[PDB]
Design a protein around this ligand. Structure first.
Ligand SMILES: *[C@@H]1O[C@H](CO)[C@@H](O[C@@H]2O[C@H](CO)[C@@H](O[C@@H]3O[C@H](CO[C@H]4O[C@H](CO)[C@@H](O)[C@H](O)[C@@H]4O)[C@@H](O)[C@H](O[C@H]4O[C@H](CO)[C@@H](O)[C@H](O)[C@@H]4O)[C@@H]3O)[C@H](O)[C@H]2NC(C)=O)[C@H](O)[C@H]1NC(C)=O
Ligand SMILES: CC(=O)N[C@H]1[C@@H](OP(=O)(O)OP(=O)(O)OC[C@H]2O[C@@H](n3ccc(=O)[nH]c3=O)[C@H](O)[C@@H]2O)O[C@H](CO)[C@@H](O)[C@@H]1O
Ligand SMILES: *[C@@H]1O[C@H](CO)[C@@H](O)[C@H](O)[C@H]1NC(C)=O
Ligand SMILES: [Cl-]
Ligand SMILES: [Mg+2]
Ligand SMILES: [Mg+2]
Length: 331
């Protein structure tokens, strides 16, 4: 293949599969990979996010600057992992007070971590480090790694989080991973998990699954991908707004990430890893990555049988959660 990602991924396959038989690491090489500037046609005219992505593609051994090593001291039933950016204090606090509160009903432990990278001064971010330290010491739910938190590094956020699950939470029965702008019906998720056989729970992966998609080639769009970078269709994948999977599958996914090069779209990368495990993510009608109908937004009963809705402001999560607590008396 002439697209760079497909070509490098093909070399990874030959390295991990002897059946294809007939030098720098791809995991901890953290100097700029200068070979790309001549191998990728038109490299110097690509947007800077693609330049950074290609140059540092082969580095993924980043360290935890803020950890919660005992977050899973009690074996969790459901681990909530929410991707967030440093300045999103209102979003995280609204999630703590509403659908992301830690609980222990029925001795089914629900624990919560927020997943952050760094917002460094070199990239003109305001210094909010003291506020973040304050928030971490009070709420103890912040995991932070030492890489530039950007959209094109979100698949790195996924791999580093899966590494944390494998080292610090390998016994969690289920994992929900989602965004910090979605409302999640945590009560409905728990009822769904308790209705699953152990056979079905073992390789659980459900979400708003997209089939037969491909890279957008419109340079003006958010998910634009040049043809010199990737070619062909995307594997099936759940919309990143939120998906639900078992801890057992989380450990298998982490192991397989070594065999898949990082990709600028994080939920596509998780689909590539599922495909390499021989699994297909399962569409579930309760995942509304594109919101619900206008008139239904006002009726709390529209939320009783949903898993999540995208998107919702901090104030809206709290209002929906509060009304939802008495929805069994009204719907
Ligand atoms: C995902 O997250 C990772 C981890 O944070 C990011 O990786 C970092 O990327 C930055 C670039 O954004 C890297 O910083 C750059 O390093 C270049 C190479 O530095 C080496 O080589 C020079 C020259 O030999 C040495 O001087 C240097 O000490 C290193 O040995 C620098 O050349 C860059 O300089 C830039 O900034 C200066 C101003 O400070 C300008 O004047 C320059 O012209 C130039 O623009 C820059 O410092 C950094 O090394 C990466 N870190 C790691 C750990 O890999 C990814 O970028 C990020 N990916 C995405 C897509 O966001
Ligand atoms: C509903 C839905 O399908 N959302 C997906 C969409 O994001 P979307 O288009 O919804 O854009 P958002 O601003 O909501 O960001 C998505 C999520 O990633 C977090 N975030 C964003 C930027 C960043 O640098 N670091 C960070 O952690 C946000 O806090 C947020 O939780 O495309 C992203 C990939 O590009 C996916 O990861 C998102 O799951
Ligand atoms: C990753 O490991 C390599 C090899 O030991 C090392 O040179 C590099 O500095 C590491 N990267 C980070 C971000 O620690
Ligand atoms: Cl916010
Ligand atoms: Mg650059
Ligand atoms: Mg969003």
């Amino acid at each position: 293949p002439e697209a760079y990602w497909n070509r490098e991924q093909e070399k990874l396959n030959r390295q991990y599969n002897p059946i294809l038989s007939m030098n720098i690491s791809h995991l901890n090489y953290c100097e700029p990979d200068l070979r790309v500037t001549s191998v990728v046609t038109g490299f110097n005219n690509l947007p800077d996010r693609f330049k950074d992505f290609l140059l540092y593609l082969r580095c993924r051994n980043y360290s935890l600057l803020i950890d919660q090593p005992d977050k899973c001291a009690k074996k969790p039933f459901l681990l909530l992992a929410i991707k967030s950016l440093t300045p999103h204090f209102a979003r995280r606090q609204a999630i703590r007070e509403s659908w992301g509160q830690e609980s222990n009903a029925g001795n089914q432990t629900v624990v919560r971590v927020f997943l952050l990278g760094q917002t460094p001064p070199e990239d003109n971010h305001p210094d909010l480090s003291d506020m973040l330290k304050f928030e971490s010491e009070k709420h103890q739910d912040i995991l932070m790694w030492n890489y530039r938190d950007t959209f094109f590094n979100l698949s790195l956020k996924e791999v580093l989080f899966l590494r944390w699950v494998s080292t610090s939470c390998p016994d969690t029965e289920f994992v929900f991973k989602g965004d910090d702008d979605v409302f999640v019906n945590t009560h409905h998720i728990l009822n769904y998990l308790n209705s699953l056989s152990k056979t079905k729970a073992k390789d659980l992966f459900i979400g708003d699954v997209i089939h037969n998609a491909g890279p957008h080639r419109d340079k003006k769009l958010k998910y634009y991908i040049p043809e010199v970078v990737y070619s062909g269709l995307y594997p099936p994948y759940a919309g990143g707004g939120g998906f639900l999977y078992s801890g057992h599958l989380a450990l298998r996914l982490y192991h397989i990430t070594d065999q898949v090069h990082l990709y600028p779209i994080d939920d596509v990368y998780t689909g590539m890893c599922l495909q390499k495990l021989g699994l297909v993510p399962e569409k579930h009608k309760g995942f509304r990555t594109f919101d619900i109908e206008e008139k239904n937004k006002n009726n709390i009963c529209s939320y009783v049988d949903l898993m999540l809705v995208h998107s919702r402001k901090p104030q809206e999560m709290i209002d929906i959660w509060s009304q939802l607590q008495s929805a069994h008396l009204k719907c």
